[PDB]
Design a protein around this ligand. Structure first.
Ligand SMILES: CCC1=C(C)/C(=C/C2=NC(=C\c3[nH]c(/C=C4\NC(=O)[C@H](C)[C@H]4CC)c(C)c3CCC(=O)O)/C(CCC(=O)O)=C2C)NC1=O
Ligand code: NA
Lengths: 162, 172, 162, 172, 162, 172, 162, 172, 162, 172, 162, 172
């Protein structure tokens, strides 16, 4: 929901006024940056399989006990690993949504709100996902402004987990 | 609440899918026309007081019983309320143009507006006529070839027209 | 107060958040529009006398009774004419401020808040200042985006006077 | 409240003067360095949790009396409130970088913070050290020459350091 | 709505209490005054045509441009003139309503609320109606208490327009 | 909200007409009877505690199931609430007499009272009986010929009876 | 300090409004009534000692146990008797205050606010004072409007006591 | 809060005394001049807008540093706020005239206004001059012989002038 | 409604908390005390007839005018005496409810809430029921903890009536 | 609102009757078993996080469409809200066991809860499956024979089951 | 802060009420439990060192990576291990506080409030401390009522951790 | 906020130490005399009306100018307000007796009371005497040997006095 355009509207509406040249400049900066964004989102979408699978394995690599300890919260079995790949896929997919709209809105509404309660209730460690997000940042291969904005959403999620 | 990008993204999440290449290009085609969209917002907003004033003046001339003693727009408070209403609708329509999505207009302005007018005794059908006058004056101002880089805005004009028709349909 | 940069801060702070890439895109379009809009206040400043003196006369030409009606609110005398040219310079100068900050903040804080009370109390017609504003828009000589943004601010004041 | 452009506008209005060409050109120089400024906001924001975490860790390691039983930062609530205070200062410093002006830091975070700490018995000098640690970690992250078009950011990093110093001087 | 009787009820009801001898004295004063007011309204009703036609004529004499400049806000044509004498009749008829009830309620509810927005939106000038009301005060020919109370309602409207 | 004078004015405005000489002389006739109307307001008010107490007493003696254990008016809280209701209704009726118009009674007291008693389980028809006893006690006090200038008050007494009957009809 | 004049001011101040002819008529009604109001006050004061001692006596006759039961709340002895005549004198004096200002203000503020708490705390029966107030009504000997208004404040206290 | 009658009642309550005949006759004297008191309230109120405009216009003409750029009354908002203060003071003074007691002026307008202007940076002595101009214009309107039954209002005039001087002395 | 168990719940619910060992100790306290409370309630119920008639007669002796003066509020007729015994029976029965739940809930909700307005409206003296309550305390014949807890509720109602 | 004692009192008050000797003796029997009642409260509360976590885990594994993209329990916010619902229900059930009465469950948690889920788009029958799983796990913990004085808890266990079944049936 | 006696006071004070037999029964059940709680407190204090060392060691054996991975949050060095045993002591010492006061207040105020923020900021896994509390529960050797009230506060902390 | 147990815990946490064996035994002996403390609370609460009424009665008999016309406790409002203040303090004193700690009395009742009586003009010293009379009556009711198990409550009675004394001190 939170995009530069919706934030612009919400602000003007809460002040009961028309959009001025201030909010117009918001659209300029958004439409200027959006090709870099929709650019980064097209690459992350194509590389999503190898990125989520590699992120899940990198978590296992830094935290090998997650594939070893017995319990529903862990990836000791196929079910656990499938749950982990699926989670990492959620993170990456919603991160692309944020790129497509140019704001953290999708991250806030679909991923981050309620996340700490989820990670607490199911004994999922935030450090697990931080490492997966670090691997994505280290392997998505983006460059220029698409990489800078993609990394700021990744680090946005990292900041929430820590 | 939603812009054109979030509309696509929200629908993708219910499917749990990444946006396709065509969807990203379709959205990218919209961003490339961002300067015409910004002109339509700026041109309507810069003329809103005149657009509304013409709308209510033409409406009350066409339907003088609205301002005759006993009418819905008689007395200064009701007359001013009627002007505010057309200006409120025009404002939320420029919101929709700016966002490329009508959700802000549907959720915050049009939702339940007909039932509000019926509870008030305000002729919704006459509001629709007033909305259509806002629409004709806005499009004439948006399509003005003077003082702007000449080009094609017919696609955007049809989109702007759809927001007004949607607003009119909600009250008629 | 209200600029692209302060509005972005105000939104993030009211929501208790660090700035995100949404807000950074606000600074991008705004730093893109500034160089031009800035020089476009240097033009308006260099021409302020001519534009103000011209705008005031254009009000007299369209409403000649303002130069004749014997009353303190009118420009029938020297004192009245000085007050009028002063007012017109106030509008133009604060409009140039709006160009400098890329927002209506200066107009809202220095000019428009309290304006209806002023014009009512001192029996000053808004139609006088609309005309003045129309002359400025017609004669400031600006081109491109500088003209458009300046004209948006001129019509912003015209909108609050009508 | 004010960005760098408004502060000069606010000063000129008290004089009733248009901005001089030197004033307009000076603001043009700020606009020209805006990519560096955006990186400074992005880089500090993208590391805020790590910067704050390292600040309380290094502060409490240099002053164990703060965390020892009875210490001001002892108990989970006061340890968390202490982390929160550094996180708030860092957030309002990032606001000041983004605006090129300290008014949002002064008005919203620093105004009356010295008196607040006194009333609670919180060591203002210990808070200042934590802010200094916020500064050092943030500057090294801004000055990081990796993954960025190389350039000179020394004037911006000098400006960023003054926001931290200002906050530190306001609690001490 | 706002009359001596309704204000007495509203004040008591906001305190959740019965009327006392205070509110009776309010009714005694209103009833002592009603006769010379009721007959004021009877005089203003009979002379409404002459007062409103002359009141608009007085505005044209002081402000000749209102019968010459060719815009919709102006009485330069037969239509403009009809709108103007119509307005003045609205002012006068509601002023007599205030006399009938002994309070500004009808003026507040039917005339003044939203009036500043009307005059702004349609570029009607407040001095036009102030001058028309000054003419009505000088020519209604009432005397004694009715003239005093009617003039208070006339000046009440003038106070709103300035 | 409205009194007898404002009612006629409100009806006159919807037609955009001045009050006729007949409508003025009628209003002037109400003013002439203004002392009798003051006597009714002062007399009912000066006895309202006894009027209500007599009303609930007779109503409860009439319908013992209301105050018996399990009844709507059983326990001290609900007995006090039942007393307060008949007091509230009498108070607004005194307002309507003072105004010479029932709008204050309709708008503020009676509107929704039927639906309120249904949601509570309070027998509205039993409230109507209590309102009838508020009316009987009040009229006998208004028509009391002692200690007052003797004259005709049948017309006012009919008006007062219509307010009570209007309240009794609106509770069930 | 609730009077016809303070209520008018407070109502106009609460709405941020100047006084209008509505409130002027309140003052007219108050000044029209004040001669009768002050006359009742002057007669009641002159007969204060007779009315007070007689009202206290009427209570003793109506409730004889108040002079026979031995307790702090009873006038069985001279201490209670002094308290009782003092109390009855408080009621009458504050009642004359209500006539002086033409409103229940003095009664509400000096006598009634908190009265049920004092009676309950010190075991004083409200019936005792209702009987005394009845005797004052029957024995003040006022006629016309000063009687009607005096009896409305007497019945005002009686109502609060029941 | 208090009028002349309540002031006397309250003073008599501290003594536990009935009003004397001299006090009853003093208040009966104020009742007799109530028509003059109503004219003064009506006449000041009826010209309230013109009186205030003249007070700020003449004050600003004498002290142009108030309106000049940077002045306390500079910008449209502070200019309106200055007009609003004098209109507020004039409104409460008409309350006091209507009441025959300055308590409403003291309790609601003057109390702390001296310290409010100090915190704001408003020159209180300039406000006092503006009040003095409200007083001079008001007294001229009250003492206007036209359109009124000729009589002696010098005592009322002196009472009115003390209310204004009280307000003027409270801001300096 | 107010019991040790319901107050425990209402406190934990108002803070969104599960019940902890604090509220469990509340239950232990309630259960340790319940046999003594249930003892007092069974004894008062078995002796309710003689305590109720006896208490109402103690009022008649203490205040003979109640069986003597003629009025709706008095027990001078058989109608009055019946009402009186009913009231005393209400007090005693609701007091036994308090003992049954171990708290003032039944007294507050069924008896005390609104009691002051009832006694004032029907001219019933709190002093009459204080004497009835004093009689019940002196004659219920309880000992030990049941007497202590019963008296606390008896003194609770007396406190309310004074 | 009510515990087991107050429930019997509320019913006796509507009849205007003292409790019978049998009614008292029944309540004295609930008091004698109160220790088991406290153990069932302690034991469920002590394992609430694991009971809720296992309730939603088994529910979502039995009904995977709920957590699939677009499902009601999909996204982190809705998955958390679903956990909270079962946690809230279990919390009110422990209130009901502690009070020996279901009024706190009915009045505060179940009242209108069915309709709430109907207006939210939440499958009520799915909530009931979640509630049934709270029941099974809780009873297995209440009846855990280890670390507690052995005895008969079958009647209390049956009462606990009725609370869960009551809540499951209210949401279906 | 949160004790059976302070909750009883807080509830009564929020209702403007004196204490009643309800709160007295709270103190009774609380004075019944006291001897038990204090016994568990005196034993947990004497055994605190062996419980704290053993609970940390139980975490090391369950999650061996906590003594291996080289990071500040881990107990791979002596500093870490010391921090870890310090934390377990904090949990244990404040749990005994809860027994002394018969309520969760000390746990809420000294340990739990802001605990989740600390574990996330410093990358401390809640499973580490849950496992330590499990070791304390199965090794304090308490019996009877002191056992289950001690285990309730233990399971209380475990609930806020999961 | 604190009882006697939490106060010892709060001081031990600031030292990071467990409670010593003596500190536990001392808190144990407080529990062993909890019945006396429960009587002290119940006896004062059961007689709270008579204690307050006797306290104001003797206070006003000692200081007649408090209730004489113009007195600080003259008029019903001030007389009820005076009764209320002593009742509030007495309730907060029984709060302190129950907790065996003065925090609830200090934090919620005495905090800012002396300032309030100074802003009002109420004689703190007269209030201090009323408190002392609350103490007088309360202590004679606690120490009453009839209808209670004979024993020694001297230590508790000394504790009760210090709370009253604490309250008297903070208002003088
Ligand atoms: C819910 C209502 C309720 C309350 C409040 C209550 C309090 C209470 N007071 C007690 C006795 C006792 N009570 C007292 C109190 C005192 N003896 C004196 O002579 C002093 C005047 C006074 C000082 C306060 C003493 C000294 C004892 C003996 C030792 C003890 O048990 O504390 C006991 C133990 C049983 C007994 O001996 O009676 C209880 C439970 N019981 C209830 O059911
Ligand atoms: Na105009």
């Amino acid at each position: 929901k939170k995009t530069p355009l919706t934030e612009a509207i919400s602000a003007a509406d809460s002040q009961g006024r028309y959009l001025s040249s201030t909010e117009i400049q918001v659209a300029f900066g958004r439409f200027r940056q959006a090709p870099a964004s929709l650019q980064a989102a097209k690459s992350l979408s194509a590389n999503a399989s190898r990125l989520t699978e590699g992120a899940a394995q990198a978590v296992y690599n830094k935290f090998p006990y997650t594939t070893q300890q017995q319990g529903p919260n862990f990836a000791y079995d196929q079910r656990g690993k499938a749950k982990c790949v699926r989670d990492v896929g959620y993170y990456l997919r919603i991160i692309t949504y944020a790129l497509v709209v140019g704001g953290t809105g999708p991250l806030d509404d679909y991923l981050i709100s309620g996340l700490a309660e989820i990670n607490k209730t199911f004994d999922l460690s935030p450090s697990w996902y931080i490492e997966a997000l670090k691997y994505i940042k280290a392997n998505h291969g983006l460059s220029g402004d698409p990489a800078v904005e993609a990394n700021s959403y990744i680090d946005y999620v990292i900041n929430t987990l820590s | 609440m939603l812009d054109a990008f979030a509309k696509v993204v929200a629908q993708a999440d219910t499917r749990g899918e990444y946006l396709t290449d065509a969807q990203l290009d379709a959205l990218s085609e919209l961003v490339k026309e961002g300067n015409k969209r910004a002109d339509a917002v700026n041109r309507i907003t810069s003329n809103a007081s005149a657009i509304v004033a013409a709308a209510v003046r033409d409406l009350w001339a066409e339907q003088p019983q609205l301002i005759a003693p006993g009418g819905n727009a008689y007395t200064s408070r009701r007359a001013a309320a009627c002007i505010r209403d057309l200006d409120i609708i025009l404002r939320y329509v420029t919101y929709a143009i700016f966002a490329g999505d009508s959700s802000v207009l549907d959720d915050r302005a049009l939702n339940g507006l007909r039932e509000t007018y019926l509870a008030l005794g305000t002729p919704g059908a006459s509001v629709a006529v007033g909305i259509q006058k806002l629409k004709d004056a806005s499009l004439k101002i948006v399509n003005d070839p003077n003082g702007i880089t000449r080009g094609d805005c017919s696609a955007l004009a049809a989109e702007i027209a759809s927001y007004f028709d949607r607003a009119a349909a909600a009250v008629a």
